[PDB]
């Protein structure tokens, strides 16, 4: 968890060294809403992820999309593939088309290449990331 130069913590969550009520460090978490269940690994995990929809400072609002994971080779973010049929009216026929969406995946989620993920729109996380994994299947 502390594999970085700076100390990783949830901002403004204070663990008071004097009182020592509980062994576990105090952990803040929220429910993202829209009927998406906060996983228990988020509640009782130890990771720090500012872009997590359940423990970070990021809110899910806007479009809710679904896709198939096609790449998981880069850290805490994946690339999903959304496929659709585009209608050419002159020939009265369809053509297969696709688009690749890069999505931030919280370490509370475990994903392989090929599984179906539902993702929720959030604010720009990086140059190309505007979505966040909220459900895996």
């Amino acid at each position: 968890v502390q594999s970085e130069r700076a100390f990783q913590k949830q901002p403004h969550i204070f663990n008071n060294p004097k009182v020592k009520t509980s062994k576990r460090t105090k952990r803040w978490y929220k429910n993202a809403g829209l009927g998406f269940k906060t996983p228990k690994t988020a509640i009782e995990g130890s990771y720090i992820d500012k872009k997590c929809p359940f423990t970070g400072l990021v809110s899910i609002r806007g479009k809710i999309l679904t896709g198939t994971v096609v790449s998981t080779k880069m850290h805490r973010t994946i690339v999903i593939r959304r496929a659709y049929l585009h209608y050419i009216p002159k020939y009265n026929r369809y053509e297969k088309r696709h688009k690749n969406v890069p999505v931030h995946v919280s370490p509370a989620f475990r994903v392989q290449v090929g599984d179906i993920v539902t993702v929720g729109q959030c604010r720009p996380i990086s140059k190309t990331v505007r979505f966040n994994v909220v459900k895996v299947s």
Binding site: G33, L34, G35, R61, I64
Partner: protein, 244 residues
């Protein structure tokens, strides 16, 4: 553009004003105020095109600078002041009280009211929040902030505002069976009763409305304005009663 615009082409003006396309090149651009640009009737249009008391803009300015026009009980001297839905316009010299309500066509009607009915207006609650020092307040559709509201008042409810004091006299909750007025969309101007409110979290709510003729239509919740209980509106309605 490098800043806010100040002109409005006639073809770009709201259609419900009924402006002649060949009268000029520009239309009265409403000034900033209680109501939105597309949902407001500037006083020049009301005084000249609707009431015909003024023959042109100069006469409208002459009328206004005499302090003859009051909007919700306060004298307004700006020609493009954005009067809007449920506003009370008073002309004491002619002994006229008007309320701005759309007709079935979707256009603001010339609706004359009595002084007793002119003493108040209705406001749809757009927001309820605690201000500084923990003082609750409600923001209505006309931008009025009213402090210390009844705790039962919630968003989408309608508050009856006394114009002399600007305080809440009564209120109507948003519920099934309540009488509602459509303030947007193609059903603008229709009146009916709520049958059901379809809820979509993260999206736009939909409301089903049934008119007295039993015709049913669906509208977004933003376009619905509760005006009273069925058969007992809190305001006088224009001719047609919002039918068709």
């Amino acid at each position: 553009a490098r800043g806010p615009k100040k002109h409005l082409k006639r073809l770009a003006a709201p259609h419900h004003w009924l402006l002649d396309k060949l009268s000029g090149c520009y239309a009265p651009r409403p000034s900033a105020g209680p109501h939105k640009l597309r949902e407001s009737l500037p006083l020049i249009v009301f005084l000249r095109n609707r009431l015909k008391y003024a023959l042109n803009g100069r006469e409208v300015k002459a009328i206004l600078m005499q302090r003859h026009v009051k909007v919700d009980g306060k004298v307004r001297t700006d020609t493009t002041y954005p009067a809007g839905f449920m506003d009370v316009i008073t002309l004491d010299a002619t002994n006229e009280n008007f309320r701005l309500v759309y007709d079935v066509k979707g256009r603001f009607a010339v609706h004359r009211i009595t002084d007793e009915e002119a003493s108040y207006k209705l406001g749809k609650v757009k927001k309820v929040q605690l201000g500084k020092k923990g003082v609750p307040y409600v923001v209505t559709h006309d931008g009025r902030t009213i402090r210390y509201p009844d705790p039962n008042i919630k968003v989408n409810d309608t508050v009856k505002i006394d114009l002399a004091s600007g305080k809440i006299t009564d209120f109507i909750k948003f519920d099934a069976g309540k009488l509602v007025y459509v303030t947007g969309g193609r059903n603008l101007g229709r009146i009916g009763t709520i049958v059901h409110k379809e809820r979509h979290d993260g999206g736009f709510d939909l409301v089903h409305i049934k008119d007295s003729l039993d015709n049913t239509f669906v509208t977004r919740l933003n376009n619905v304005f509760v005006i009273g209980e069925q058969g007992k509106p809190y305001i006088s309605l224009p001719k047609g009663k919002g039918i068709k």
